[PDB]
Amino acid sequence: THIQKPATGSPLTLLNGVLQVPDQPIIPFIEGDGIGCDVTPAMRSVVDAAVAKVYGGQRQIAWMELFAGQKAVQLYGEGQYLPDETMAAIREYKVAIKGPLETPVGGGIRSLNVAMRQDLDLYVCLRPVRYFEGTPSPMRHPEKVDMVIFRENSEDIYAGIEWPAGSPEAEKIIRFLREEMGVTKIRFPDSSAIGIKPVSTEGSERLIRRTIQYALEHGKPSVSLVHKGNIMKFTEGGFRDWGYALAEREFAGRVFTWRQKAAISKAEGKAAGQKAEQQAIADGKLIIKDVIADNFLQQILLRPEDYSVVATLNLNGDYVSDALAAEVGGIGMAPGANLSDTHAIFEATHGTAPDIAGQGKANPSSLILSAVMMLEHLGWGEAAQAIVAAMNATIAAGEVTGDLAALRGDVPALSTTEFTAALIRRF
């Protein structure tokens, strides 16, 4: 072992439904590769300051370092990118927050980020994207972005099921596809690498159910199912169809969907369909609609105001998260949470930022905002709100890191530590 349980902490526990949160909870954290070394300490400093301010010391996070990535390899030895004790500790402690981890391209280890999500079955990747007043942005009207993305986190092509071109394995699956499955559409079978995309009714349903539940509980006007269901009919189109079906049987009478709208239109005409939709909106009924993924990218740029909650697949969610984050300053302003029904790993949308690593420039806001989601998860709402208020005031005053300052000629950059200080001095 290379991990040490805090001396004054007490673990979170689960008791007949409820998550029990001690006043000095043990919260595991992973530093992260690259800019993890800048953003994690900043996040802890900010969280600690907020908590001390709002509760007077009655409460205090008992941080416990766990290891993964390069820091793990250096401490545990070669190939020890994800030590067993790391995963065991997260299971036991039920919550954790992590900086980014490096995943190599074209070869090397499988994503540790994805591996953690799979191992703990954290099937919801939850990413709220909203505009902080005054944030430098490439958009004319970034304030019109206020969305919540529910990204399926356990399946899709992220499963990591693939074989390299020319390998015995690729030849073996290509032969099965052509000889046993009757596949005729592989263009270049002699040099094809092959990837598998599993998308299930069970996986789609649990993600979409949580999405609708959230939308209803928070008074959100709509849920958009985004998919490329015309080309990927049974996977992505399945996601959409299973989604509408679930909405209409588990939430009958509490939602109005575009599937229902189509039924009304087919039988009574467009006007009737439109009228029924207008009546639902008038009723405070949650609207469930759907958008093809490419057009979705167009719509969130042209009219983001028309969207609220989004339910989508793993790959689509990844791409949408980045496009949307860019509208509000980039992935330095983009928090996230990986949730199952019992556990949670809080984690920024961004990666290791190799181009600024070691320079003390990175925006810690995404991770800080992820810690906000964590505090909300812990029921420490007042601390959470204190951080959001401080963040709102800091950005509005024009105190920002370099990723934001680069977007406007009239805004200078602050280092990671300078920004952290600017935020904390406002508590």
Ligand X SMILES: NC(=O)c1ccc[n+]([C@@H]2O[C@H](COP(=O)([O-])OP(=O)(O)OC[C@H]3O[C@@H](n4cnc5c(N)ncnc54)[C@H](O)[C@@H]3O)[C@@H](O)[C@H]2O)c1
Binding-site annotation: residue ranges for NAD(+): 98, 101, 103, 113, 230, 298, 347, 350-353, 355, 363, 403
Q: Quote the CA–CA distance of 55 and 60 in Å, as a whole number.
A: 9
Secondary element (H or E) of residue 359: none
- Is residue 158 helix, strand or coil? helix
Closest separation between CB of residue 98 and ligand X, Å? 7
Nearest to 313 by CA among 328, 293, 297: 293
**294 an active-site residue?**
yes
Query: Binding to its own copies by residue 327, rule CB under 8 A?
Result: yes
Among its own copies, ligand X, none, partner that 362 touches (CB below 5 to 8 angstroms by kind): ligand X
Contact 173, 163 (CB under 8 A): yes
Options 76, 158, 244, 307, the catalytic residue: 158
Nearest to 213 by CA among 144, 97, 360, 311: 311
Closest separation between CB of residue 185 and its own copies, Å? 4
**228 an active-site residue?**
yes
Contact 93, 64 (CB under 8 A): yes
Give the nearer residue to its own copies in terms of CB position, either 263 or 389: 263
Closest separation between CB of residue 36 and ligand X, Å? 8
Query: Binding to its own copies by residue 227, rule CB under 8 A?
Result: yes
- Is residue 361 helix, strand or coil? coil
Query: Binding to its own copies by residue 151, rule CB under 8 A?
Result: no
Residue 392: both structure tokens together: 């709102």
The residues facing 151 across adjacent strands are 125, 312
Closest separation between CB of residue 409 and its own copies, Å? 11
Query: Binding to its own copies by residue 409, rule CB under 8 A?
Result: no
Q: Which of 20, 201, 278, 359 binds its own copies (CB under 8 A)?
A: 201
Contact 198, 174 (CB under 8 A): no
Query: Binding to its own copies by residue 146, rule CB under 8 A?
Result: no
Q: Which of 6, 41, 128, 189 binds its own copies (CB under 8 A)?
A: 189
Q: Which of 213, 230, 279, 359 binds its own copies (CB under 8 A)?
A: 230
Closest separation between CB of residue 74 and its own copies, Å? 19
Nearest to 404 by CA among 366, 348, 367, 373: 366
Options 197, 228, 289, 361, the catalytic residue: 228
Q: Which of 162, 171, 250, 418 binds its own copies (CB under 8 A)?
A: 162
User: Could you tell me which residues come within 8 angstroms of residue 17 by beta carbon, excluding any fewer than 6 positions away?
Assistant: none
**266 an active-site residue?**
no
Give the nearer residue to ligand X in terms of CB position, either 241 or 251: 241
Q: Quote the CA–CA distance of 127 and 148 in Å, as a whole number.
A: 6
Which residues are near ligand X by CB under 6 A? 35, 39, 100-103, 113, 230, 292, 295, 331-332, 347, 350-356, 362-363, 366, 403
* Pairing mode, strands 62-66 and 26-30: parallel
Q: Which of 164, 269, 379, 412 binds its own copies (CB under 8 A)?
A: 164
Among its own copies, ligand X, none, partner that 347 touches (CB below 5 to 8 angstroms by kind): ligand X
Options 48, 318, 319, 322, the catalytic residue: 318
Residue where the block lists tokens 């067993």:
84
Among ligand X, its own copies, none, partner that 251 touches (CB below 5 to 8 angstroms by kind): none
Options 119, 283, 294, 341, the catalytic residue: 294
**158 an active-site residue?**
yes
Window contacting its own copies (CB under 8 A); options: 187-195, 276-284, 340-348, 361-369: 187-195
Q: Of all residues in this chain, which one has the CB nearest to ligand X in the complex?
A: 351
The residues facing 338 across adjacent strands are 125, 345
Nearest to 50 by CA among 393, 398, 399, 375: 375
User: Could you tell me which residues come within 8 angstroms of residue 56 by beta carbon, excluding any fewer than 6 positions away?
Assistant: none
Window contacting its own copies (CB under 8 A); options: 28-36, 92-100, 326-334, 391-399: 326-334
Q: Which of 21, 157, 276, 424 binds its own copies (CB under 8 A)?
A: 157
| Strand order, beta sheet including 146-152 | 62-66, 26-30, 95-98, 344-347, 337-339, 124-130, 146-152, 309-312, 222-227, 286-292, 255-257
Contact 177, 186 (CB under 8 A): yes
Residues that are catalytic? 158, 228, 294, 318
